A paper describes a structure:
Here, we show that in the [name] defense system the reverse transcriptase binds a neighboring pseudoknotted non-coding RNA. Upon bacteriophage infection, a template region of this RNA is reverse transcribed into an array of tandem repeats that reconstitute a promoter and open reading frame, allowing expression of a toxic repetitive protein and an abortive infection response. The system consists of a 280 nt ncRNA upstream of a gene for a 425 amino acid RT-domain protein with no additional domains. Our results demonstrate that upon phage infection, the [name] RT reverse transcribes the template region of the [name] into a concatemeric repetitive ccDNA that then templates transcription (“forward transcription”) of the ccDNA into a repetitive neo mRNA that is then translated into a toxic Neo protein.
The region of the ncRNA 5′ to the template (“5′ handle”) forms a hairpin that docks into the finger-insertion domain. The 3′ region of the ncRNA downstream of the template is intricately folded and intimately associated with the elongated thumb domain of the RT. One long 34-nt hairpin (the “tower”) and a shorter 18-nt hairpin (the “buttress”) form A-minor motif interactions and rise against one side of the thumb, an interaction which is secured by a potassium ion-stabilized pseudoknot that wraps around the other side of the thumb. The rest of the template region is loosely bound to the RT, as evidenced by weaker cryo-EM density, but template bases 29–37 and 86–135 are visible as three helices forming a three-way junction. The final eight nucleotides of the template (bases 141–148) are visible within the RT active site. Strikingly, template bases 142–146 are already annealed to a 5-nt [name] “GATAT,” we therefore refer to these template bases as the primer-binding site (PBS). We conclude that the “GATAT” [name] is covalently linked to the 3′ end of the ncRNA and is synthesized by the [name] RT. The 5′ phosphate of the primer G and the 3′ oxygen of the ncRNA C278 (the last RNA base clearly resolved in the cryo-EM density) are separated by 11.7 Å, which would readily be bridged by two additional RNA bases. Instead, we saw that the incoming dNTP binding site is blocked by a guanosine nucleotide from the 3′ end of the ncRNA (G277) which forms a non-Watson-Crick pair with template base C141.
Numbering used by the authors: 1 to 425
The structure:
DNA sequence: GATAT
RNA sequence: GGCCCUAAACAAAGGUUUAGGGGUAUUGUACAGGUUGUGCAACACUUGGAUCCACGCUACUGAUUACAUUACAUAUCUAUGCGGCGAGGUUCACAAUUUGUAUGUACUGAUUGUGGAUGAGAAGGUUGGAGAAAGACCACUUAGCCGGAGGAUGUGUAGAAUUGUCGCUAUUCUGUCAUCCUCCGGUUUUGC
């Protein structure tokens, strides 16, 4: 068989409770609804992604940093092929309801639009440019994937497929994705005696089925979502279900913005309203009142309101608007400062590791009577300078080309000499 | 490998 | 202890409890069973040509049958750019001669062959194993940025820059020029 006829099939790289399968067995298995009705779903494996925000106070320069935790849960190989196949089925029915309601340009994330974040941010900044004096209201949903109510998700799933109730294979998948069960990966590796430093060594699955049934389940390692809300982040079906859940609210928010002569955009849980200035104080309370039917809440700490006025002939914002990795002040478009900061930390760690490897092999050349060598820097230039083809600078120059910004080019210009000075440091 | 959530 | 199957009990719910069983890597050969023709063929489906013939092709079923071979998500960009040349040796363990001896044996240096490892374009540490050695394997670990203003100093449409090195490409820069110092402002804007 050929993968090109079956776009849902992807081979995945992690270890789980079962082994990777071939295209022939996946295609024969997932196409039978009786197999889906009789399937034995394995638990998800789970861990937390760690993130830090550092924010010194600008009055007295005191340290403050906050740890942020994102719970992540990923499914087994055969389960991941079942979810990908049914997400492929649900996407075609979802896109027809997108085209019916003219929502094609409002809903941005997780759709195969052949567009990136640069084009979405460019479209938002061109709307403010055409609209003139206006306000941008930015809203964020609080705990989006963890707070989806299961009955609302079931009702939205029946409308997309167009039935009164879910069929049996769809209902089995809905049961597995809502009342899900998960096993903590570190506890499983501790109990089974698997090294956290090298797990794929002389094994192709985490354990035997006897070892699963005796050591995993009887030790209490399976934790079941018995609350009435939440779906796991890390399944192949979850992002589509997050788009399906929000559809009627997207229709209502497009109508609300269009009544007032404005525009509406949503990228996952990130929402942008571009409205005339007289509505900008009411808007967050109107959106907080109409989203209570979805049982999800706005994160009121993350609300940002910006205002654009003409100063001379140039449109000027009172503070710059951040949107999808870019900064816009009314005329100029810049990259986020945190993306350039992240590039700087990655570059410095790479150069420091290259110097450590240089020192390590120079000791060996001294021991065996060979002449010392300098720093090899093909890989450093491929990773961290413009000669590379798949790095941060190709993204930056691509963004400077698309958005027509000399300011992005002036941001990217000192990065060559900083890499050279870090090498000479 | 790079970007957005 | 979630999930699936079987059986029972209470009843009729997209049910609860008890008891027992289970978790399909890959590619083939046997073996076992269905549906059917007249013991031993035949088996699926999209599609084409005139029920029949043919192409594509998951080829009646087998995880619950044997045997054997082979080895974090979604969307987007792109797939450490490609190709020559370094390389003579060094090290470790055996084996065969000969180098100096004692009595073929017991030592000792060097030449000659076979096998492990290694230079090559940066994946770091440890008195930790294994090992004949290994640069390999196993075990345990590993304020910053952006915008603006003032200065001080240098400098100028073809040329410059970029990997151990060369070639073919490719990308970036070129007076709102570069490095460094000072001041002001921003950073709900960092997915292990
Ligand atoms: K080369
Ligand atoms: Mg926001």
């Amino acid at each position: 068989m050929n993968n090109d006829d079956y776009p849902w099939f992807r081979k995945r790289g992690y270890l789980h409770f079962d082994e990777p399968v071939s295209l022939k067995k996946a295609v024969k298995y997932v196409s039978s609804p009786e197999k889906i009705i009789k399937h034995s779903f394995l638990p998800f494996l789970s861990f937390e992604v760690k993130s830090f925000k550092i924010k010194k106070d600008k009055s007295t320069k005191q340290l403050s940093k906050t740890e942020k935790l994102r719970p992540i849960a990923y499914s087994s190989h055969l389960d991941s092929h079942i979810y990908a196949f049914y997400a492929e089925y649900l996407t075609g029915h979802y896109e027809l309801l997108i085209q019916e309601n003219n929502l094609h340009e409002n809903i941005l994330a997780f759709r195969s639009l052949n567009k990136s974040n640069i084009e979405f941010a460019k479209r938002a900044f061109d709307t403010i440019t055409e609209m003139g004096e206006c306000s941008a209201v930015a809203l964020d949903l609080s705990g989006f994937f963890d707070n989806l109510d299961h009955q609302i998700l079931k009702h939205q799933w029946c409308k997309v497929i167009g039935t009164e109730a879910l069929p049996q294979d769809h209902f089995a998948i809905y049961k597995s994705i809502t009342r899900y069960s998960k096993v903590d990966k570190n506890r499983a590796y501790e109990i089974l005696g698997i090294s956290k430093n090298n797990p794929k060594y002389n094994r192709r699955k985490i354990c035997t089925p006897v070892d699963f049934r005796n050591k995993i389940r009887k030790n209490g390692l399976i934790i079941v979502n018995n609350s009435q809300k939440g779906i796991p982040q890390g399944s192949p079906i979850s992002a589509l279900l997050s788009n399906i859940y929000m559809l009627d609210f997207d229709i209502e928010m497009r109508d609300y913005a269009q009544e007032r002569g404005g525009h509406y955009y949503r990228y996952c849980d990130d929402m942008l309203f571009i409205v005339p200035t007289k509505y900008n104080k009411t808007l967050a309370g109107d959106v907080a009142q109409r989203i209570k039917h979805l049982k999800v809440e706005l994160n009121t700490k993350k609300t940002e309101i910006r205002d654009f006025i003409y100063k001379d002939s140039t449109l000027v914002a009172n503070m710059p608007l951040q949107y999808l990795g870019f900064i816009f002040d009314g005329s100029n478009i810049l990259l986020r400062s945190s993306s350039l900061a992240r590039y700087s930390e990655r570059m410095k760690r790479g150069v420091r590791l290259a110097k450590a490897t240089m020192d390590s092999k120079n000791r060996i050349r001294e021991n065996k009577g060979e002449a010392l060598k300098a720093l090899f820097k093909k890989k450093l230039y491929a990773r961290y300078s413009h000669i590379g083809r798949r790095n941060f600078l190709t993204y930056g120059y691509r963004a400077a080309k698309i958005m027509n910004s000399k300011a992005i080019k002036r941001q990217l210009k000192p990065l060559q000499k900083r890499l050279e000075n870090e090498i000479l440091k």
